[PDB]
Design a binder for this molecule. Structure first.
Ligand code: SF4
Ligand code: SF4
Ligand code: SF4
Lengths: 148, 57, 111, 335, 392, 184, 212, 66
């Protein structure tokens, strides 16, 4: 409805890997990562097409090659692994972090299931993959969304 | 019929912008297939829903 | 006239500031590093850029007082703050609303 | 704490009349450009006047660099409390009246003259060259279009034999629509309608800088809550001016018998409970519904006439609208 | 604070400049109501286009060029590909020549429609500003079909011709568009010629004589609106524009009203050149050109050097031959020329863009002499300026 | 005098009377407008949305770099002298630096690089646009295969006669691809 | 060291406790800013036409709640639509500081992200608007479609709702002022406000008109 | 001023049936019906403002039968 409580935070601690279906004009998804951020959970909103292989990006270090633009050699910037570098800067008095992936609807189902099975093998870490659209913002776990 | 990555299909449905364009398919996935259309100057692959693609020999 | 050199991290004005209102002077140059809090500073490195700000003002005190010459000082300060990131002295602020990483991404050293 | 119910219930009507006009501005001007208007917020833009006003409350209302602090803050307050106070004049409803003042169409034309001072302490106190120039330009424009605006009220003061706005709508209730003053004063309606539109609307105004005579006018350095008085107070002046078009010339709370067919801008049933609530509420705020027609006509007139320059604006109130307002006062008399 | 003095007041138009013709900055000084001097500050969009081309090949610079006159688009690509194809003597096929006439005349309509909308709002009535851009969106999709982009960044012009042929439902879609837009050209003309309040802001306001227009250096609908009749599509026999019958719009008045009626008449003459080129196409429609490719594919009157979109698809390592050059294209805004001198390598030695608006903006101080304050954007809106062409 | 202001007022107060009528007739027409997130407009067949990539096709020859206006696509390749054929190990086109001119998809012999139709790429980070070879090899987002978007067609794709894409129940482009194969 | 350009650890606990009432007021605070934010009518290069095509009839600007304002104070959003050179680089920061603090700059086109096509070799282009002002949403394209800008508005609208009402303190600039005295010679300004009335346009000077 | 007799007949129950009418026929309505449609917005506007966040005019999902 309109008056939303904190059921979105409890569903994320239950499932670990949610899948929001937000209105496509925006503005109503981010009211649920404020209830998430009020409960100690920090948020790293990334972009789902910008990630490469999620194994080599999130839990492994990746060599990002910047734009040399014809006036530079092929530099290889080894960035730290994203979910395990933002966990160590996250202090242990607060809760985990959430991956607020936007435009999740261009991710394959093999990358959906990899984000689903990672949230329990890695402690204090969850994902919310914004996939698809609906007239009313609603969520479901990623375990049965790949089973659709 | 099933689609392998590299056969020449052509679109058959009329409620589509690409009515009868043909080309090589590329990167078939769990429900979707992208068909490289080989159109003129800039080659363009467009996603489809693994149907309405009748190949030719 | 208010000759100024306003990059993202360096705001060098030609004048002194009395409570927000900048008054154009001829003798002085005012500098506030990081108007937006993109880098989390400390007491050590804020004096390290004062070893660079008063160095470049004293070095370029034989040239003209133009917007081109203030931009040459404000650029070499902005090349000095970026060297403090690559030395790991200061780090990016996470309480800021933007996380666009203007002075390069975090990356590990030698793979 | 808002103890008079005639003062509270009028004020709810006095603010929802503005929020109609901000909604009607963004939807009628979208229909004349074949676009939607504000969708996706509320049902169809119903919360878009609320969203445009509520964001100006939550923004950091910062002053400019070297400005007079007390004249900058009281700048928009001289413009808009004279048009917030004269909502005690407007008589909507047969059994609804807030104050039976002996005048009020003269008190409104007296209160609207404080508004050129607020355009002078908005141009001066913002302390830049282009807003002081826009301050003297906006002030000398509302100066020019008041003596034609005061002489149109003088025309409906002879026919009503007084300045009482209860007596003014009482002279137009003996025949319903044949006794309206727009049928008796066809010229002085135009003297009222052009001169009032040159002090509240968006068409004869240099506050949009499409001609670049200034930076953005006098309301350039104003932001946040102080601009909310300049933005949501120019539609207060639009509704208030359109409320008096629907009182002086058109009969306030005056309309024929509603015992009509389904084509009476109503439902289908003759005896409907939806028409018994559309008759009682219309018996409470009727001249607001009539003022919603001239608010609509003010938006519709914006996209017809050219954006005329200030040299031909001031040569219209003095050289044209003032002699046609003088001869209308004589033709209203015997002569 | 702000004081009230008796000397003439100088106001800064500012590099902010909320208008659709770039970013100018006019330090115009006022004498109460009349202006007495004005300096234009340009260069706020100087991205160094001439230094770029000395380290670009021609296929690497073709995306760069449609950003000078970004109202026009492919008028910049016309001068670009004509600089080595008229120096190396590379023959352009006849069909690709008529596609260039089709694309350039549609750009001049879009050049004039982007001029027209802001000009009508600066001179008065603001309601056609939203109905003119709707007519430009039809021209966007005609380029979005044939090329891959709306109005600029459309790599269509090549050294041996054009990039590709038209789409299938394209030639019938000017016949939907330019048989519908041409009734609206006279509708735009009757806005200012009728309603005689607009003529009191454009008669004698920014008047330039014929003798001062050639001396100050002018081209296109600002030179021709002083009674000159100089058009480089007629003067230079440029790429099969001489195969059509079309009159050069001249107005011997000099004022801003003469500049309005010429640019409206350039829209009307452009549809004439379009309809003579759609019917004068060598192979006609591409779906009918490709039809003869299958019935007589061995050796026909078709499949020649003409009836195709390119002569020879050149390599990326195409060396410009040695020699100076100056190619001229009559744009919608004037003469857009480039002074190419190249060495025997793939980079040119000097690429001096001579813009049509850089030479028309230098008259703006002289046109703003005795004019009023409300008639400053009425002058600047009538020069048909795009900054980015002026500054490069 | 008084016999002039009843005649000098009519000459334009009726011209705005014939101007208020035409603007009210502008409201009579249907709003021709593309509501974006519920009616995304279909791109053309040649639209250069973003570049796709085939890692099993790129034979390491850097033609995409030499034809790019800014030499943008990073081709990381080793020579691999045990097999005597250069095999790449990383490929990236940093979008945001990328002008979508698509010289790389035109001068490619093996037909690896190709333009997609998705323009809906907009990140909160500049470095989230540096697409990987497996991030560019992802499947595009088609406007028609989305159960929230009613895809309206573009001009020069409607049938011959109609200049709008809203009240279009069926049809195709205004010409046929191969109509004359059994005719001629 | 260990990691180049590191992330500073937030030592604050961020004790962002709130009841049902205060977050219900925070939803109205964020909705009122995402749904009627007013963009500045700003444009330098080619991306202003793609931005002005979105003002028009085919794509509706005022449909998300976007009203273009030709003033920095009345506007909050500023869509940087155009390549900014060394000039317009002090002018764009001046347009940015004259705004109320919920600003949310979005970069539009390739030349406000990394200075896209003039990022290779250009002597006066700042490579990306994020070398001058902080950017909320990036938008690639050259030029972007008017549909593609309305995605960047939608991506921006999802960022306003994440903003918290008790995190309104970091929106104001911090002031680490420092002061040094220089010895540079002051120069008279080059661009004075006289062009035609300058004493060199009225007549050609001597020792040059003799050979004319 | 009534308490709950005629206030709820204008603020609560009649804006719900206009929102049934506004959602159904707003774009398909003719030139004469839209002028009456704009009248129902400005007249019931204090009632239309209360039940504004409880109705949405977003279109329904499609079926994708191709
Ligand atoms: S242009 Fe094609 S063949 Fe050449 S390197 Fe790129 S992908 Fe490989
Ligand atoms: S789109 Fe342009 S910049 Fe990007 S890889 Fe292709 S040629 Fe290079
Ligand atoms: S990338 Fe191209 S379209 Fe975008 S701002 Fe730069 S020049 Fe204009």
């Amino acid at each position: 409805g309109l008056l939303a409580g904190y059921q979105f935070v409890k569903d994320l601690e239950s499932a670990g890997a949610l899948a929001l279906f937000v209105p496509p004009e925006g503005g109503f998804e981010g009211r649920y990562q404020r209830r998430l951020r009020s409960k100690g959970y920090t948020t790293l909103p990334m972009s789902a097409p910008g990630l490469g292989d999620l194994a080599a990006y999130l839990t492994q270090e990746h060599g990002i090659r910047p734009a040399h633009t014809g006036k530079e050699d092929i530099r290889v910037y080894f960035q730290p692994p994203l979910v395990t570098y933002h966990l160590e800067n996250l202090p242990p008095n607060a809760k985990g972090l959430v991956l607020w992936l936007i435009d999740g609807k261009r991710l394959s189902k093999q990358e959906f299931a990899y984000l689903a099975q990672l949230t329990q093998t890695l402690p204090k870490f969850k994902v919310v993959v914004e996939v698809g659209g609906d007239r009313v913002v609603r969520w479901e776990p990623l375990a049965d969304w790949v089973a659709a | 019929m099933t689609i392998l990555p590299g056969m020449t299909v052509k679109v058959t449905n009329p409620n589509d912008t690409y009515y009868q364009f043909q080309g090589i398919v590329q990167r078939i996935t769990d429900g979707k297939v992208a068909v490289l259309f080989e159109g003129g100057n800039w080659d363009k692959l467009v996603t489809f829903q693994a149907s309405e693609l009748e190949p030719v020999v | 006239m208010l000759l100024k050199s306003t990059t993202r991290h360096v705001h060098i004005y030609a004048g002194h500031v009395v409570d927000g209102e900048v008054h154009p002077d001829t003798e002085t140059l005012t500098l506030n590093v990081d108007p937006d809090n993109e880098l989390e500073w400390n007491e050590a490195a804020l004096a390290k850029v004062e070893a660079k700000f008063r160095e470049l003002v004293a070095n370029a005190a034989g040239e003209d007082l133009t917007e081109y010459n203030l931009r040459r000082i404000g650029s070499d300060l902005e090349h000095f703050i970026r060297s403090l990131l690559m030395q790991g002295e200061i780090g990016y602020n996470l309480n800021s609303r933007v996380r666009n990483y203007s002075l390069g991404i975090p990356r590990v050293n030698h793979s | 704490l808002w103890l008079p119910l005639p003062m509270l219930m009028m004020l709810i009507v006095a603010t929802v009349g503005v929020l109609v006009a901000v909604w009607l501005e963004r939807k009628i001007s979208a229909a004349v450009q074949q676009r939607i208007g504000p969708e996706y917020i509320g049902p169809l833009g119903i919360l878009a006047p609320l969203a445009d006003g509520l964001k100006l409350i939550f923004k950091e209302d910062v002053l400019p660099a070297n400005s007079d602090r007390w004249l900058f803050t009281l700048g928009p307050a001289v413009v808009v409390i004279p048009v917030f106070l004269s909502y005690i004049i407007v008589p909507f409803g047969q059994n609804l009246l807030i104050s039976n003042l002996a005048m009020g169409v003269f008190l409104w034309i007296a209160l609207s003259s404080i508004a050129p001072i607020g355009l002078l302490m908005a141009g001066y106190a913002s302390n830049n060259k282009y807003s002081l120039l826009g301050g003297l330009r906006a002030a000398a424009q509302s100066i020019s279009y008041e003596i034609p605006l005061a002489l149109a009220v003088l025309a409906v003061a002879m026919m009503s034999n007084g300045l009482g706005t209860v007596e003014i709508v009482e002279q137009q209730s003996q025949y319903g629509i044949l006794s309206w003053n727009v049928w008796r004063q066809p010229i002085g309606f135009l003297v009222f309608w052009i001169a009032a539109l040159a002090e509240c609307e968006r068409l004869p105004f240099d506050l949009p800088e499409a001609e670049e005579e200034l930076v953005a006018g006098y309301q350039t350095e104003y932001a946040g809550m102080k601009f909310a008085l300049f933005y949501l107070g120019a539609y207060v002046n639009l509704v208030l001016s359109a409320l008096l078009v629907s009182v002086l010339y058109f009969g306030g709370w005056s309309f024929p018998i509603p015992l009509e067919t389904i084509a009476n801008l109503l439902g289908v049933s003759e005896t409907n409970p939806f028409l018994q609530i559309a008759f009682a509420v219309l018996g409470i705020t009727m001249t607001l519904i009539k003022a919603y027609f001239f608010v609509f006509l003010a938006i519709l007139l914006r996209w017809t006439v050219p954006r005329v320059r200030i040299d031909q604006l001031l040569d219209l109130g003095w050289k044209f609208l003032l002699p046609v307002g003088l001869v209308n006062l004589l033709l209203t008399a015997g002569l | 604070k702000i004081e009230t003095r008796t000397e003439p007041m100088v106001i800064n138009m500012g590099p902010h400049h909320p208008s659709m013709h770039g970013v100018l900055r006019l330090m115009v000084t006022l004498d109460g109501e009349d202006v007495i001097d004005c300096e234009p500050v340009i260069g706020y969009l100087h991205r160094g286009m001439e230094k770029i081309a000395e380290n670009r090949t021609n296929i690497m610079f073709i995306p760069y060029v449609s950003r000078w006159d970004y109202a026009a688009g492919m008028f910049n690509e016309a001068v670009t590909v004509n600089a080595p194809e008229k120096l190396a003597g590379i023959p352009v096929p006849k069909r690709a020549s008529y596609i260039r006439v089709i694309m350039l005349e549609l750009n001049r309509i879009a050049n004039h429609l982007l001029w027209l909308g802001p000009f009508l709002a600066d001179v008065g009535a603001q309601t056609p500003f939203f109905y003119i851009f709707r007519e430009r969106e039809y021209i966007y999709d005609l380029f979005e079909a044939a090329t891959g982009m709306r109005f600029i960044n459309n790599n269509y012009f090549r050294i041996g011709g054009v990039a590709a042929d038209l789409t299938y439902g394209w030639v019938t879609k000017c016949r939907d568009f330019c048989d519908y837009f041409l009734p609206k050209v006279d509708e735009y003309e009757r806005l200012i010629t009728n309603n005689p309040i607009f003529v009191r802001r454009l008669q004698g306001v920014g008047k330039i004589s014929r003798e001062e227009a050639i001396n100050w250096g002018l081209s296109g609908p600002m030179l021709r609106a002083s009674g000159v009749k100089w058009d480089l599509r007629k003067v230079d026999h440029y790429e099969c524009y001489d195969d059509f019958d079309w009159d050069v719009p001249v107005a011997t008045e000099g004022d801003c009203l003469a500049r309005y009626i010429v640019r409206i008449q350039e829209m009307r003459e452009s549809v004439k050149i379009i309809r003579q080129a759609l019917d004068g196409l060598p192979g006609g429609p591409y779906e009918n050109l490709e039809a003869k490719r299958m019935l007589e594919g061995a050796k026909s009157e078709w499949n020649g050097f003409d009836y195709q979109y390119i002569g020879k698809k050149l390599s990326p390592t195409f060396k410009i031959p040695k020699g100076e050059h100056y190619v001229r294209v009559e744009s919608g805004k004037g003469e857009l020329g480039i002074y190419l001198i190249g060495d025997d390598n793939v980079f040119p030695w000097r690429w001096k863009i001579r813009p049509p608006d850089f030479n028309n903006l230098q008259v703006l101080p002289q046109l703003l002499k005795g004019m009023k304050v409300a008639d400053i954007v009425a002058i600047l809106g009538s020069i048909d300026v795009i900054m980015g062409s002026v500054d490069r | 005098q008084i016999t002039n202001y009843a005649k000098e007022a009519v000459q334009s107060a009726k011209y705005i009377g014939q101007g208020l009528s035409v603007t009210f007739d502008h409201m009579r027409r249907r709003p021709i407008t593309v509501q974006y997130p519920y009616e995304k407009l279909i791109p053309s067949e040649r639209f250069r949305g973003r570049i796709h990539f085939e890692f099993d096709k790129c034979i390491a020859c850097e033609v995409c770099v030499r034809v790019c206006p800014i030499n943008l696509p990073v081709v990381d390749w080793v020579f691999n002298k045990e097999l005597k054929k250069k095999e790449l190990k990383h490929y990236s086109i940093d979008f945001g630096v990328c002008i979508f001119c698509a010289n790389c998809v035109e001068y490619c012999p093996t037909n690896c690089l190709s333009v997609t139709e998705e323009y809906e790429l907009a990140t909160y980070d500049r470095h989230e646009l540096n697409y990987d070879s497996v991030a560019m090899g992802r499947i595009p987002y088609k406007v028609t295969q989305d159960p929230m978007v009613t895809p309206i067609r573009e001009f020069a794709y409607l049938p011959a006669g109609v200049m709008s894409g809203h009240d279009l129940p069926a049809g195709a482009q205004r010409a046929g691809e191969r109509p004359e194969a059994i005719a001629n | 060291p260990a990691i180049l350009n590191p992330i500073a650890r937030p030592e604050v606990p961020q004790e962002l406790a709130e009841n049902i009432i205060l977050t219900s007021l925070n939803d109205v605070y964020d909705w009122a800013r995402l749904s009627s934010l007013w963009p500045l009518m700003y444009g330098t290069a080619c991306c202003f036409i793609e931005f002005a095509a979105m003002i028009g009839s085919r794509f509706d600007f005022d449909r998300f709640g976007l009203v273009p304002r030709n003033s920095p104070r009345q506007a909050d959003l500023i869509i940087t639509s155009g390549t900014i050179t060394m000039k317009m680089a002090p002018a764009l920061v001046r347009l940015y500081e004259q705004m109320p603090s919920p600003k949310y700059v979005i970069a539009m086109g390739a030349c406000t992200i990394t200075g896209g096509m003039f990022s290779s070799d250009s002597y006066s282009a700042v490579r990306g608007v994020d070398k001058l002002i902080p950017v909320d949403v990036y938008l690639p394209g050259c030029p972007p479609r008017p549909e593609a800008i309305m995605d960047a508005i939608v991506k921006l609208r999802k960022k306003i709702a994440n903003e918290h009402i008790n995190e309104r303190g970091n929106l104001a600039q911090t002031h680490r002022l420092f002061t040094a005295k220089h010895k540079m010679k002051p120069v008279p300004p080059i661009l004075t406000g006289q062009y035609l009335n300058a004493p060199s346009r009225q007549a050609p000077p001597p020792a040059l008109a003799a050979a004319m | 001023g009534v308490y709950g007799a005629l206030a709820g007949l204008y603020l609560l129950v009649v804006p719900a049936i206009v929102y049934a009418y506004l959602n159904a026929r707003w774009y398909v309505a003719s030139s004469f019906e839209r002028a009456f449609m704009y009248f129902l917005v400005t007249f019931f506007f204090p009632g239309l403002l209360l039940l504004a966040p409880f109705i949405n005019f977003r279109p329904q999902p499609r079926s994708l039968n191709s």
